[PDB]
Structure 1
Amino acid sequence: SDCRTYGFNTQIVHAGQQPDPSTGALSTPIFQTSTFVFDSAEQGAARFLGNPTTDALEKKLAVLERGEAGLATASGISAITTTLLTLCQQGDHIVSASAIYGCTHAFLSHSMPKFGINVSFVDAAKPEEIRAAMRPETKVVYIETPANPTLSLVDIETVAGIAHQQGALLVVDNTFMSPYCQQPLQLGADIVVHSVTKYINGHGDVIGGIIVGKQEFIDQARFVGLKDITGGCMSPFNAWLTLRGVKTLGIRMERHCENALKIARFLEGHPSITRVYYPGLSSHPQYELGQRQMSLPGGIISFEIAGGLEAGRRMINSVELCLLAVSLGDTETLIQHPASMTHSPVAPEERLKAGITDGLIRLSVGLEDPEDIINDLEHAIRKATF
């Protein structure tokens, strides 16, 4: 049949893959090669980036996002830069959300302008700010959603109409949702990018990225962006592992989301916790938008602990099961305290303008028994807050 006709779990398992024609091997073979051979001069000319393993991953993700074609990359950052460096040149303009991944922010704020490409940062939770910042030279509107670190949302369908009316493309980073929870292209986005490093692979052992969009664009991203600009090839072994990890995407996302809701409710009920940011809680500022745009509220939670900086340090130093790390989207529950860890070299007043308060903790909820995670949190919080 055609894999675009089956239910979503069936697509997760099967799309882009088939038993090996010549051997019947069911697993996609790892084509760990750099060299492909021709049968003849003619065969070689006719042919005149490409690998069967990576192709299977690209086709699968294209199906899952409901896009025409996929392109794998060496990293999520390379998926973002290959895309934007393919689309933009000296004199072009980009309108970007402000609440985005920090390294994306550095690329947009420092790298692009040095190539003659200007960027305007706006609060993408306010579509009007996006409209106001558009220019005749604007090629791209770039957004992330949910956005960290307070899990605020962006109304993709609305922003898409705005960008399109002014002749720009919409690019959406769908990393934190995965195709299982959100499909930006179905809401009008033109291009979706992911760090597969997170939920798509899910097993914390692959760095990689993926871009999905129209065939016309993807061909340019491949034959110019990858080939002639970033060189950000995904290795066939990484692609194989990502295919393997993605087989369980549906069941992992269900369990991540189930666990995260329970933990979020526990945190909301806890007197030592001042705030809890999780789209699955009714008290969330854009709760209804989230209900329409996302099939599930996700596995990521942020929260503020009473007592600011020192409480945040005490709490992370007191967990026994949760692991301290800056990654998110793995099978293990991961936790971090940006102010004391990643952003301590930053000015307190400046961190605040990023939405990073001294007491903010970020939590990636894993596949453990939620009771064990809650017990670990409860224990650490109690220790941290007297």
Structure 2
Amino acid sequence: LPGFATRAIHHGYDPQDHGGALVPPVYQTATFTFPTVSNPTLNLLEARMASLEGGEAGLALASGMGAITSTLWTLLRPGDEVLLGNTLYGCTFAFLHHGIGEFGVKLRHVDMADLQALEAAMTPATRVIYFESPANPNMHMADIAGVAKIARKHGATVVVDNTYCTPYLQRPLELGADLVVHSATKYLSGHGDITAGIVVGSQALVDRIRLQGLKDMTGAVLSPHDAALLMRGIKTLNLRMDRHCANAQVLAEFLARQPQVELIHYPGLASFPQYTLARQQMSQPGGMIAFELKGGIGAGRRFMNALQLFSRAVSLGDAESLAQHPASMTHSSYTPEERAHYGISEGLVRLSVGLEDIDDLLADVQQALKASA
């Protein structure tokens, strides 16, 4: 089998099939005609992501939320139950609790790392088990293989949001997951210029999602133009993730030596709670770092406002380094003790480590750390 990098560049395409074009032409057309009485650009992206993820088929959508909703609207119906990881991406949480959850679908959050508890929460109604790994809060890891075994016993469908790792660092399908969902807007695109989502899994499941969730319940159609840009980004996925991870590791070790830092959440540190599990499922620790300042919410606010290279934003996986402090940002409306509920610390700061020179990033952080004193 050709290597990952080779497939990310060539899988599913032969220039001789399109007039010798080295780069596939963009099928920016809404409709196709018939000689007598699917979009190729999108089909290539899908086959390529399926190949990288180690799955039978792929589906491309307008956004990560488009992929999540199309998938869940397809697999769930009133009466069905869905077990969820204890923490989820903001909009995913809203979708479940304020969306499909208000339509007769039962929801329940369980620690996906606690196989005992998971086995206990299972019921004959449990139709889907959905979670992210690592999870948005403090990189909580889930035992994918362990969860898949239980799910396989009860006949439940396992859906894993693999946004953070990408197929390059983790492949849940190879660990038992039935479906993998991605916000391709992040690492896959890698350049923060498109919004897109991806679904990969068995031909049977993906066909259903395509013809039901996407076609009829969301209409989250991805533009061929953006699909092309996404494939452009995927061509450097391995190289970009290597740098993201190498930069993050150095930055994490630097932060671990800071007096002002109380706690550090990074899979690459030996003191990481689930260090062993992470290494079992991930080939590299990732480009995301979560940490807490001893000064609480005030220290985080000052740290954030002093950053000059890092950007204050909510996304991740871009060439540019990004930082966010939920306490004084996304969750600024949530009162102190109230904020703690969602697991958000008052001094919790999350960094999406970019591709810029590491010493420049270390210098920005060092400089900002001084301003949060």
Alignment TM-score, normalising by the size of structure 1: 0.95
Which of 336, 351, 362 does residue 363 from structure 1 map onto? 351
Q: CA deviation at 1:20?
A: 5.7
Say which SS state the counterpart of residue 186 (structure 1) adopts.
helix
Matching residue of 2:83: 95
Does the Cα contact within 8 Å between 1:16 and 1:58 map onto a contact in 2?
Answer: no
1:76 pairs with one of 64, 81, 98: 64
Matched, 1:339 2:358: no
Is there any run of 5+ residues in structure 1 with no aligned partner, and where? 42-49
Pairwise mapping of residues 174-193 of structure 1 onto structure 2 (< 5 A)? 174-193=162-181
Contact 1:112 1:119 in 2 (8 A): no
Q: d(CA) in 2 for partners of 1:168 and 1:365?
A: 36
Which consecutive residues of structure 2, in runs of 5 or more, have no partner in the other structure? none
Question: Which of 102, 106, 117 is residue 118 of structure 1 equivalent to?
Answer: 106
1:237: which partner in 2?
225
Letter in 2 for 1:147: A
Cα deviation, residue 17, structure 1: 2.6
1:39 corresponds to: 35
Contact 1:71–1:218 (CA under 8 A) maintained in structure 2: yes
Indicate the percent of aligned positions where both proteins have the same amino acid. Answer: 52
Whether 1:14 aligns to 2:2 is no
* Structure 1 contact 324–336 (Cα < 8 Å) conserved: yes
Deviates more, 1:293-302 or 1:347-356: 347-356
Aligned equivalents of 1:316, 1:340: Cα separation in 2: 9
Summarize deviations over 1:113-132 as a string: whole Å, max 9, x none: 22111111112222222222
| Residue matched to 1:23 | 19
Report SS of the residue matched to 2:228: helix
Provide the rounded CA distance (Å) in 1 between the counterparts of 2:339 and 2:16. Answer: 52
Higher deviation after alignment, 106-115 or 288-297: 106-115
CA contact (8 A) 1:322 1:333 kept: yes
Aligned partner of 1:310 among 298, 301, 315: 298
Query: Would you say the 8 A contact 1:315–1:384 is kept in 2?
Result: yes
Alpha carbons 2:18, 2:24 under 8 Å: kept: no
Structure 1 residues 109-118 or 247-256, which shifts more?
109-118
One-letter amino acid matched to 2:160 = V
| 2:64–2:182 CA contact under 8 A, matched in 1 | yes
Match of 1:140, SS state, is strand
Q: CA deviation at 1:323?
A: 0.5
User: Given residue 234 of structure 1, which amino acid in structure 2 is its aligned partner?
Assistant: L
Whole-angstrom CA distance in 2 between matches of 1:64 and 1:351: 38
Give secondary structure in 1 for the equivalent of 2:182.
strand
Q: Secondary structure at the match of 2:306?
A: coil
Q: Which amino acid aligns with 1:117?
A: V
**How far 1:18 moved relative to its partner?**
2.6
Find the aligned partners of 2:349 and 2:239 in 1 and give their Cα distance: 26
Mapped contact 1:176–1:298 kept (Cα < 8 A): yes
Asked whether the equivalents of residues 260 and 294 of structure 2 are also in contact (C-alpha less than 8 Å), the reply is yes
Structure 2: how far apart are the matches of 1:127 and 1:171? 16
Q: Stretches of 4+ moved more than 3 A in 1?
A: none
User: 56-65 or 125-134: which moved more?
Assistant: 125-134
| Whole-angstrom distance in 2 between the partners of 1:343 and 1:131 | 33
State the 1:329 CA deviation: 0.6
Q: Retained in 2: the 8 A contact 1:17–1:60?
A: no
Worse overlay, 122-131 or 321-330: 122-131
- 1:246 pairs with 215, 234, 252, which one? 234
Q: Which residue of 2 aligns with 1:46?
A: none
What SS class does the counterpart of residue 371 from structure 2 fall into? Answer: helix
SS at match of 1:339: helix
8 Å CA contact retained: 1:198, 1:330: yes
Aligned to 2:157: 169
Q: Are 1:155 and 1:289, in contact at CA under 8 Å, matched by a contact in 2?
A: yes
- Aligned-partner residue type, residue 110 of structure 2: V
The number of aligned residues is 373
| Alignment match, 2:341 | 353
Deviation digits for residues 132-168 of structure 1, max 9, x if unmatched?
2111111101110001221111110011101111110
The amino acid of 1:230's aligned partner reads: T
Which letter maps to 2:304? I
Per-residue CA distance 1:167-219 (angstroms, 9 max, x = gap): 10111000000000000000000000000011111110111100001111111
User: 1:47: which partner in 2?
Assistant: none
Query: Following the alignment from structure 1 to structure 2, what is the Cα–Cα distance between the partners of residues 349 and 112?
Result: 28
The residue aligned with 1:296 is 284
2:16 and 2:106 mapped to 1: Cα distance? 47
Alignment-derived partner of residue 206 in structure 2 = 218
The superposition leaves residues 51-84 of structure 1 with CA deviations (integer Å, 9 ceiling, x where unpaired) of 1111110000000011000000111011011111
The answer (yes or no) to whether the contact 2:64–2:184 under 8 Å persists in 1 is yes
Matched, 1:127 2:123: no
SS at match of 2:208: helix
Contact 1:30 1:237 survives alignment (8 Å): yes
